[PDB]
Amino acid sequence: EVTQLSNGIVVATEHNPSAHTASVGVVFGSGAANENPYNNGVSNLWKNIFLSKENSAVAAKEGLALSSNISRDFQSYIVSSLPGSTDKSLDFLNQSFIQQKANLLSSSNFEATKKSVLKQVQDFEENDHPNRVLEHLHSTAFQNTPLSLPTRGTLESLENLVVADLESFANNHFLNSNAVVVGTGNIKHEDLVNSIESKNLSLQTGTKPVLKKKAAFLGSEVRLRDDTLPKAWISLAVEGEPVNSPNYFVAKLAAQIFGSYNAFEPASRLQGIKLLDNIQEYQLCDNFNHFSLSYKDSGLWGFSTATRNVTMIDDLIHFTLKQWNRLTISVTDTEVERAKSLLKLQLGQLYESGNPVNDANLLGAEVLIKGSKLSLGEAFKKIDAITVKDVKAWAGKRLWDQDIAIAGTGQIEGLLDYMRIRSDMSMMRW
């Protein structure tokens, strides 16, 4: 059961007696979308300061494990431990992250962390193609709007930061009205609330800055061509649904219909996905996957693919977009029936895995928007209630003759112009 109390800070807890671990954490409603192009990467630097050697050493001496996660809409700082020592994690979180920040922002520590983060971002930008392609897709989809800033930070901006930027961001965003205290695993809600009440655990006053511009989607493309690479990596997307939309689960199911494909695994060549019937003959791709990502203001629905067949890219894109076209007009009931159970198993593993850190992140990110956490059972009935008419109604609105965003790198010379791709979003025979 999920129990949430608004006394003090918003305290959420999900109790699981079977687990042998307990996680206690703080989730902030600010993310990479709350920063600007001149201090971009301040959140990643804060994360790596919390994860620095001295802080991690003092934590691990007591027997605790530290996790930090940076995203568009939230920042997560989690302390995981054994069930008997769940009170010690609160003490470490109070003493280190909240009460005092002078020790963590010393000159030498800041310089070392800055040099390590610069090295990491430099390695990412050159030797991680499928993920940086998705980052550029975000950066070109939401350009000149908060949601397009990369979460790690750019190489040029990360140099200009000083400790003053970090402390300014901490003053502006680490607030009581922006925070949720989350408890996961083998702990009780009453015990957690009592433990918080015994201490003060006050973060700050409130009134975080309000953004003047809301995120917007622009049809656009960016091409980063490099002929010294062996493949071509391509990510393509349209505007999707945000969190708290009525069509959220319909979006995830429509994504699940096409699924993912790996050419080298024997089993995934026999899937009921009809798209493979066009792909398999000439080995058009090595792998693809479909995504329905949702944020607070907007979302992305699309796919990502990698291939060595540098002379047949347009055929791959054409067949994929013709499979997308089929959703509006001629989706069949068996497709939806398979999609329901595939999605239920897909959602089942996500929310019911052994690791409590994923549960903590999900619960903290959920209560910061909805105000409450949807149960597993009520999720299934909405999934089971989906019909063919709903899928057709959603697809006729979100992907029929709509603008797209594209991002590719590698031997993308075979990738045709924008308009030729944009015309594939309709059939013209219907």
Binding site: T228, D417, Y418, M419
Partner: protein, 51 residues
Amino acid sequence: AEPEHDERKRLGLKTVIILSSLYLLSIWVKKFKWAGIKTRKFVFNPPKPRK
């Protein structure tokens, strides 16, 4: 010498008006479809000579 004189000059008015607005409509459609290449912007950053 020209018993088709009057009909030729009135079929011409129909053909010129139709073709002159087709000619103008084609310029808008040409520019609409060429709009993504007319304002396309290139940047150049020299790669490192390490490789």
